[PDB]
Subunit: 118 residues, 4 copies
């Protein structure tokens, strides 16, 4: 069973802590990233999909950055590799805030992140 | 004035969305309604609105926990006041499908956009 | 038959001209966009998929920006709407140039563009 | 020195790619080889490398014209000189599937990444 609750770290060096996942699949947590003024914490809220009670469920969460006007959403699946290790393969969209609707076209970045247990 | 997320919205695909009040922490919940040819499904959503600098056109993100499949979709965008004075949500999303092998991961994510206006 | 050859314009106001598509599905053209110093032209190269000689083929092309170090790639399908009009529904990735591999994560933007005959 | 596109590459998924010489206009052609469980397919690719400011780590883009399906994939990225001195192509791609109705357009595009190193 791949569980989201716990401590994770990714390929960029960012860390994330997720608490208990309730009966509805909802969970909260903290997302930690460094600036290079050193470390900043931002809350995250998301849900794990519980349809068919898969052992490798899909999920999604939003990171509400506390040091910028931007928002990032992550979606992915909690996998169990060949070694028996849990791994989160995710993709994200990073939304920047623009002051005019005419600039909307360049406000969204996309990328990936792989998380492993810390 | 300010663009507010709370309310009823409909998008360019015909899906409807209801968002509740946004608390002090910027959190909100709602419902997402889509069709399937009418036979309609209803799924819950949870997200947050960025409160930094209390901008009048904030960015936000939410997750839709589909109740009819094992998939998950996340949306992010900004609440704009268009040139004609109408409120409009410009969003982009990622649709994550469930795969059985970590080896099939590469083909599990679709991307697209959705524009929402008040219902 | 939805054909790529011709003049197109999109939702942002940019214009594009594509020449003849050869037997291998390859085509070239010009991509015009304004700055708001007014108009700039950049060449594009791409290919249309010819498998099963579909009347609504998929395609892809790269725009080699002549005023920046960035590159944009578009992929989409040439459709025929209910009115009988040709429409190109596309999605693109805009790659910015970063000076260090450590900044690679924030170098890619994503978006859409719908083109109609000009 | 400079990161050059010309040569043989292999990615994290196991696919191989051969890129030819890049002319003065920054144009190039090549071949993309992927497996299907070995039974391997071969498809042509055409793209360009950005020549502005003759950077040593240029951005580029190319299209792969799949010969076994009606799909098309485009890649874009940058040719980097990693910290250990190795040349590496960091890329992102969009995979466009063919749909029969403009109404199914929304679900026709997948997105992902690929990292290429010299073979
Ligand atoms: O507004 C921001 C907030 C920064 C966290 C950003 C992203 S979320 C996906 C990725 N995974 C992580 O763990 N962290 C990153 N970012 C931002 C915007 C612009 C620039 N810039 O240099 O221009 C730098 C950072
Ligand atoms: O698993 C699913 C759940 C369906 C809702 C999907 C997306 S979320 C972005 C877009 N905006 C909307 O309002 N609705 C859609 N979808 C799905 C997967 C595969 C296929 N298929 O035909 O293969 C059809 C639907
Ligand atoms: O480097 C660039 C080259 C500009 C053309 C950009 C994109 S390609 C997708 C979209 N569709 C179009 O027809 N045109 C646009 N762009 C760029 C980068 C940064 C900023 N900026 O303000 O920061 C502005 C433009
Ligand atoms: O139509 C296709 C053509 C297959 C090559 C696909 C992608 S291009 C990005 C990635 N990097 C690679 O080196 N190869 C892949 N693919 C396709 C579509 C659907 C399914 N399916 O199982 O449903 C399988 C393959
Ligand atoms: C979190 O990851 C490890 C856990 O101890 C730690 O060494 C590192 O400094 C932390 N990184 C960040 C960005 O907080
Ligand atoms: C929701 O949007 C309007 C609300 O009145 C309604 O006419 C339409 O049938 C609904 N669409 C769906 C997919 O539920
Ligand atoms: C191209 O689109 C129309 C075609 O005549 C023209 O009016 C407009 O000025 C042009 N736009 C750009 C960005 O070149
Ligand atoms: C290509 O990569 C190496 C080249 O020697 C080879 O071992 C491998 O089998 C090939 N893979 C594919 C998918 O053709």
């Amino acid at each position: 069973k791949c569980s989201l609750t716990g401590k994770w770290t990714n390929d960029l060096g960012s860390n994330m802590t997720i608490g208990a996942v309730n009966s509805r699949g909802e969970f909260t947590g903290t997302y930690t990233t460094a600036v290079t003024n050193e470390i900043k914490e931002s809350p995250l809220h998301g849900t794990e999909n519980t349809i068919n009670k898969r052992t490798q469920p899909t999920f999604g969460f939003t990171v509400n950055w506390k040091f910028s006007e931007s928002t990032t959403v992550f979606t992915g699946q909690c996998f169990i590799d060949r070694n028996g290790k849990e791994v989160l393969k995710t993709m994200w969209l990073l939304r920047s805030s623009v002051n005019d609707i005419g600039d909307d076209w360049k406000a969204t970045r996309v990328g990936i992140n792989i998380f492993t247990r810390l």
